[PDB]
Amino acid sequence: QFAKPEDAVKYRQSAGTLMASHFGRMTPVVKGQAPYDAAQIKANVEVLKTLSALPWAAFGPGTEGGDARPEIWSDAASFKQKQQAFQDNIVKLSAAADAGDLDKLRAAFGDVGASCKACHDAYRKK
Ligand code: HEC
Ligand SMILES: O=N[O-]
């Protein structure tokens, strides 16, 4: 769906912006600094699940640019493992939110954040 590589770059950066907002806005809730409303969190995690599926199709071959490292394309299999594992971590967060279970939500939130960071450390330029 991208006329030039620059359009794929703009798309995946905007998806990252929205993912950071929908993930990070739950930090005060998992810390107990803001109240826990199970329905509010269930709906927010639904939005995060949709968004978290979107970046990967915008790293098609030849779309190099932005702060993407070249290791994404020459090692297709390792990059795919990382995005699939990340989306699995999001399934655990969705199961916790759907159950209304704050203990499971805290643990799943930490695992999701670690997965964001592990990919950025390997595949995003400093
Ligand atoms: C690989 C398997 C990734 C996972 C998991 C996550 N991110 Fe990511 N992110 C990734 C790359 C390769 C890039 C660079 C894109 C480019 O072409 O520049 C990014 C970028 C971001 C950004 C910055 C967007 C911008 O302003 O330019 C943000 C804010 C971001 N990513 C957030 C984010 C969050 C919150 C994640 C998990 C919840 C997450 N990313 C996972 C690769 C990967
Ligand atoms: O949102 N980072 O792929």
Curated annotation (Swiss-Prot):
It holds the Pfam family Cytochrom_C_2. Heme c binds at R12, Q13, D67, C116, C119, H120. SUPFAM superfamilies: Cytochromes. GO terms for biological process: electron transport chain. Transmembrane segments: none annotated. It comes from the Bacteria. Its main location: periplasm. Binds 1 heme c group covalently per subunit. One of its GO terms (cellular component) is periplasmic space. It is found in: Periplasm. The modification Pyrrolidone carboxylic acid is found at Q1. One of its GO terms (molecular function) is heme binding. Keywords: Electron transport, Heme, Iron, Metal-binding, Periplasm, Pyrrolidone carboxylic acid, Transport. InterPro entries: Cyt_c/b562 (IPR010980), Cyt_c_II (IPR002321), Cyt_c_prime (IPR012127), Cyt_c_prime_subgr (IPR015984). Homodimer. Cytochrome c' is the most widely occurring bacterial c-type cytochrome. Cytochromes c' are high-spin proteins and the heme has no sixth ligand. Their exact function is not known. This is Cytochrome c'.
